[PDB]
Amino acid sequence: MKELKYDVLIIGGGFAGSSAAYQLSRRGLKILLVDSKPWNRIGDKPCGDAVSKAHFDKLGMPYPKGEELENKINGIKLYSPDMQTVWTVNHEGFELNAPLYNQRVLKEAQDRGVEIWDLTTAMKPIFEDGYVKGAVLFNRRTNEELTVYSKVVVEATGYSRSFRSKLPPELPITEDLDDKDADVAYREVLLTKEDIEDHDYLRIFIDQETSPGGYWWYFPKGKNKVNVGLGIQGGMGYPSIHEYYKKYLDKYAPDVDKSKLLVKGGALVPTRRPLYTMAWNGIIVIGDSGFTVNPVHGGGKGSAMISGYCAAKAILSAFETGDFSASGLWDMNICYVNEYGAKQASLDIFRRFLQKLSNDDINYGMKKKIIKEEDLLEASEKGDLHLSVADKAMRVISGLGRPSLLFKLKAVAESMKKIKELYLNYPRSPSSLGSWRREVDNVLTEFNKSLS
Numbered sequence: 290m291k292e293l294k295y296d297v298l299i300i301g302g303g304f305a306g307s308s309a310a311y312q313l314s315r316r317g318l319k320i321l322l323v324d325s326k327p328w329n330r331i332g333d334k335p336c337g338d339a340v341s342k343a344h345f346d347k348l349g350m351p352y353p354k355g356e357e358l359e360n361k362i363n364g365i366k367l368y369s370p371d372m373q374t375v376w377t378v379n380h381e382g383f384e385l386n387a388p389l390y391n392q393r394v395l396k397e398a399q400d401r402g403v404e405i406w407d408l409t410t411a412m413k414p415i416f417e418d419g420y421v422k423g424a425v426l427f428n429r430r431t432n433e434e435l436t437v438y439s440k441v442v443v444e445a446t447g448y449s450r451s452f453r454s455k456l457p458p459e460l461p462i463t464e465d466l467d468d469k470d471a472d473v474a475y476r477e478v479l480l481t482k483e484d485i486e487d488h489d490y491l492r493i494f495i496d497q498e499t500s501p502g503g504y505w506w507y508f509p510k511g512k513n514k515v516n517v518g519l520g521i522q523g524g525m526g527y528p529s530i531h532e533y534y535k536k537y538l539d540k541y542a543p544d545v546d547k548s549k550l551l552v553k554g555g556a557l558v559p560t561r562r563p564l565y566t567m568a569w570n571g572i573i574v575i576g577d578s579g580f581t582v583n584p585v586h587g588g589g590k591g592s593a594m595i596s597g598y599c600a601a602k603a604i605l606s607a608f609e610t611g612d613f614s615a616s617g618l619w620d621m622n623i624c625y626v627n628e629y630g631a632k633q634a635s636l637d638i639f640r641r642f643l644q645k646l647s648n649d650d651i652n653y654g655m656k657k658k659i660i661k662e663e664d665l666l667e668a669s670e671k672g673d674l675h676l677s678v679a680d681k682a683m684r685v686i687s688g689l690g691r692p693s694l695l696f697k698l699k700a701v702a703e704s705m706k707k708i709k710e711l712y713l714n715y716p717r718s719p720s721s722l723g724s725w726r727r728e729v730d731n732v733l734t735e736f737n738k739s740l741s
């Protein structure tokens with residue numbers, strides 16, 4: 290079999306993969322990125338295609354340009370179950386042509402030196418002497434099995450985790466997710482008969498009956514084109530998602546013409562804290578494969594780019610120390626946790642609370658303004674539910690006569706700050722990962738119990 294040697298092998302060319310390749314380019318390294326999909330189809334996984342503007346600024350990534358930007362976004366409208374209360378949150382963002390932008394990022398990284406092979410699949414992890422040292426690839430372009438060696442493998446295979454799942458089960462980097470720590474989501478993109486009111490605003494509909502554990506959304510991709518879909522918490526016993534979709538479509542999008550459908554289909558999306566470690570001997574995991582999705586609103590394309598940034602940073606460190614062990618790549622964790630991980634950990638706890646609320650809990654909480662329209666912005670910008678804000682909210686649900694889960698919002702706010710306290714104190718060395726993880730597990734075990 291043919292053999293090749295590279296410094297870095299990036300498996301998967303999604304938002305996470307292309308972010309790693311872009312950031313690692315022009316640094317004196319020999320890089321190979323692969324993706325099973327053909328070039329023109331790379332990055333077309335079922336998505337809402339809605340990404341925050343703040344993400345692009347931070348990392349110094351290319352702004353959506355021209356055809357890549359389908360519709361400019363200025364904010365979000367959060368509708369209550371009975372729809373008697375509409376929260377308008379001002380937050381700038383983009384509704385983009387996801388495959389078109391993704392391929393541009395790849396096209397540029399290719400110009401900056403990175404090599405990209407489409408129609409190529411990582412089939413077997415090369416794992417010898419206790420290290421990930423590359424992979425066996427199948428290039429369907431030339432029907433050839435090639436063996437690629439690398440000092441560091443970047444796992445960016447998405448929610449499938451098709452590569453790292455084939456690693457031995459004692460590696461912390463093969464951590465699996467529980468069914469209930471993920472949501473199945475489905476979406477379609479159709480044209481509307483009439484225009485779209487406030488088309489520069491995203492619409493999110495909370496409703497535990499029409500989308501239990503998640504929500505419905507109405508994302509305008511233009512003047513007369515809309516990305517409508519929903520998400521539901523998995524591992525609960527809920528019926529097929531396309532049954533929820535078919536039953537309640539007209540309720541959230543009656544203006545669409547069902548004959549002008551462009552794309553459909555759905556996929557899995559994780560709604561939890563990131564992998565306890567995203568780095569191990571000779572391997573870094575990023576994107577959906579490392580559970581980098583926001584547990585509350587389910588956005589994952591912004592925080593995927595962050596994981597890719599932190600991956601380049603960690604790898605450049607490892608090569609400067611010739612150390613590709615977990616310890617040598619460990620800065621991947623310290624970086625991502627400070628950037629988005631600690632925020633996720635706190636929101637993981639908050640998600641567990643929000644998913645358990647009745648429609649009456651949300652109808653009451655929103656109508657009575659249990660929190661500001663700007664404090665919901667802060668609670669998911671920094672992932673913090675301030676002890677002073679919970680107190681202002683707790684004295685509003687005091688005027689509630691019926692029993693509710695709302696009365697535990699204070700204890701939830703304390704548990705959120707507690708687990709974020711832990712993630713700020715992330716292990717300095719891999720020697721502490723085990724001890725620190727079980728403590729995190731204890732925090733979640735206790736909190737899960739406190740909701741009952």
Ligand SMILES: Cc1cc2c(cc1C)N(C[C@H](O)[C@H](O)[C@H](O)COP(=O)(O)OP(=O)(O)OC[C@H]1O[C@@H](n3cnc4c(N)ncnc43)[C@H](O)[C@@H]1O)c1[nH]c(=O)[nH]c(=O)c1N2
Nearest residue numbers: 301303304305324325337338339411446447576577589590
């Ligand atoms: C229905 C729905 C709706 C939304 C979203 C998800 C879902 C399911 N998300 C989440 C978002 O889609 C997701 O979090 C990011 O795309 C994660 O990026 P990745 O690159 O990790 O995934 P992605 O799945 O794009 O990465 C996998 C890539 O690697 C390739 N690959 C996998 N295994 C391979 C192998 N063994 N060999 C070679 N190639 C391999 C695949 O072909 C693919 O190109 C979202 N996000 C957001 O922020 N805003 C939104 O509006 C939404 N809405």
